[PDB]
Structures are given as C-alpha cells and as structure tokens.
C-alpha cells in the first residue's frame, strides 16, 4: 500500500510549466528514504519540513507538482520569488511548507522543442494557480479577434532545450512536494 511517488518522479514525460501536473497523494504509506538518499538530484530545498524525518509523521494530504523549466529558473521555485516562471507559470506561497526537488534532464528532454511557458500575462498568478489559457494576448487597445499580429502576442513561448546549450539553459525536471497536517485524520503516514 505504498504511495505512488514513482509515477511522478520517474514519469516518462513531464508537463510544461504553464500546465504543471499535480498528483494528489492520500490513504497510503510512503518510504521517503528513496527520495532523500538519492544522488541524482542537483537541488533539494525544503521549507518548514525535514525530509530526513519524513518517515515518522502522518500528513492529511500531500501534493506533488511536476513540470520542466530551465536551470536559470530553478531559483524562482521558492517562496517570495519573482520572475516569469514565478509570476506567470508557477507560484509558491510565502508560507510554503514543503520541498522543491530538481535535477538535470538534458538527456531526456533535449533534442537535436515542445515544453512551453507563459510569456505574457496581465497580473501575477496567485499561489498554486494553474493557467492553461491560449487566448491571444492583447498588448494594445484594439481587440485581437484571436489572430496574431501587431499588439497581439501568443501568450506561450517554447523553450530551446538543445543538447549543446549551457547548463543553465538545459531542461530540469522539477517535483514540488506540498505537506499539510491541519486538524483532520492524517491518512498519509510513513513506514512507521
């Protein structure tokens, strides 16, 4: 009765950051030792939780968020951060209580392309908000009528993700673990 963390971390293909996947985790036991003993990850930053002691606590619900960004943009996956990814694609709350895990995936997500991110938006995303709109972004006063042109921009932009790029430009698969305890039956326990 183990939690399906493998289906998230070891997924064959990840979602674009503007359309980040979220996996609800409940009514299961999780051996986090696999996650926190690994050497594949390049960054594993936790806020308000201790991953090395995650095997001795029960949460009510755990959310796993999956997406792909650039190496330069990994720092934007953190509370109180600003930038195109944080403002327009994926935003963490200031009181975030969870772990942010990222690793280089230049071998899996770079071709000698399809991952996208939102480039234009009127206002910043609220924390844990998902926006998949493809409506033509109206940069002027004239309505766009859903066609690209002057003062009418497509809101999404495609990453490069080519094997010859620098490390900061290479794709990085990111999994964000969200933990909530609250006052409720805690049905997500460790191997305790």
């Amino acid at each position, epitope marked *: 009765n183990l939690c399906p963390f493998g289906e998230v971390f070891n997924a064959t293909r990840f979602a674009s950051v503007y359309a980040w996947n979220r996996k609800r985790i409940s009514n299961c036991v999780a051996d986090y030792s696999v996650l*926190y003993n690994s050497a594949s990850f390049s*960054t594993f*930053k*936790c806020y308000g939780v201790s991953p090395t002691k995650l095997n001795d606590l029960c949460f009510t619900n755990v959310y796993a968020d999956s997406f792909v960004i650039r190496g330069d943009e990994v720092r934007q996956i953190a509370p109180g951060q600003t930038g195109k990814i944080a403002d327009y694609n994926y935003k963490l709350p200031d009181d975030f209580t969870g*772990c942010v895990i990222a690793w280089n995936s230049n071998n899996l997500d770079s071709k000698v392309y399809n991952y996208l991110y939102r480039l234009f938006r009127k206002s910043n995303l609220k924390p844990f908000e998902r926006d998949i709109s493809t409506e033509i972004y109206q940069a002027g006063s004239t309505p766009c009528n859903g066609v690209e042109g002057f003062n009418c921009y497509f809101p999404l932009q495609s990453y490069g993700f080519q094997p010859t790029n620098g490390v900061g430009y290479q794709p990085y698969r990111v999994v964000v673990l969200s933990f909530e305890l*609250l006052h409720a039956p805690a049905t997500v326990c460790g191997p305790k």
Partner: antibody
Amino acid sequence: EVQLVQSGAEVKKPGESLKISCKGSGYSLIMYWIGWVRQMPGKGLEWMGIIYPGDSDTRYSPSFQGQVTISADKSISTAYLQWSSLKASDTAMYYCAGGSGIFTPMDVWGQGTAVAVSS
Amino acid sequence: DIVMTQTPDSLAVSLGERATINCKSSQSLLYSSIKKNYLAWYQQKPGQPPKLLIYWTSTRESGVPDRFSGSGSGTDFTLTISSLQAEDVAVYYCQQYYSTPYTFGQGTKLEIKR
C-alpha cells in the same frame, strides 16, 4: 546519516583574518542547511547564520550581519565562516549545525572549533 | 526577533526524581499549515557539542530514551525528565525555528540533588 567534521583549533593575533571550515559526509547531504553557532566561554548558544550549499542561499542573524562572512563550496560539501579582522571579543568555540531544511531543527552537530584571539 | 526565556537558570533534583524545565516564547510558534509548534530541545554535556533531543515540542529524536518528554502549546513549553540519571547532567536549551533568525534560550544547568 550525515556527520559534520570541523577544522582544528585556531590561535590568532588581533586584526588577523581567519577562515574555519565544516565538511559533511554521508547520504542526504543535499538536504542539510548548514548554520554556525557561537558559544563564548561560560555562556549560551548564539545563532550566527545559515547557508544552503546547493545555491549558496545565505541568511545572517542581525547581530552578526556584516561582522562575519558565511560561504560554501558544494563540490566538497564544505561550509566556511570567515572574519576579515579578528577582535579579542571573538574568542569562543564555534559549532556548525545541520538540518535537512530551513525552519527545521538542527540534528547533526560538528565537534566544535576553538578560536582564541589574543595579543 | 523572537525571545526565548527559560526558568530556572539552575535546577537540582535527585536520581530517579522528576526534572521540569520551562520555556516561554514572546510569540506563538505554531505553523498554520502544519499545526505543530516549531520548538526544539537540546542537551549539551560538558565539553560536548549540543545534541537534539525533542523537536515539534513532543517528537523525540531517534535513540532518545523514554524518560525525556516535551509538552506545551502556544507560548509556553515544558521539558520533563521522568527518572533523572547521572548521565543526564548537562545544560538544556530550548530553541525556536519558527522564523529566522534562530534564537536559543539562556540555558538551564541541571545537576544531581545529593
């Protein structure tokens, strides 16, 4: 489990520069945030700062902001505490403590480095 | 900065007796999302580095004997030792990790009442 090993004892004249180190080993190191705790002789524990080795996310206590410099080198799993100009009032034992997150208790502690600044 | 105050400064109880150390915080240490108070207890033996005993005010570190126990809520917290042993003679600190900067208590010196 992570263990922390610190550099040896240091004896310095006032006005000199010092750099002690704190190197960790074992699996799950890339989780541990490394902080520095000062303990003057016969006194309590003072929290100086903390740094995450992965991206050098350094945060200082207001009492130690600008007095010391905290850096890291993630290629050798080593954290550093540096003084530009030592004073006689810096004579204390310095521990490095580690915790698998920020806003998380520090479970792994180093053996401690004794620093004496005297003429 | 949050202020941690411990009572008393020094305490002496006999072998097998109960030792009680108080720790008052100037601010609530309760995280809203994870409803556990972000308080820790540390033990420092003479010549030894501090050792973490209790975190989240009730959960004990692995290998910490059953004689140690923590309680309290809000701004008042308590560390209790059921049967004091000669190996428990040390200085005990309460530390909060609710927000930076981290702040410790002044410490409590525990000896054996003989």
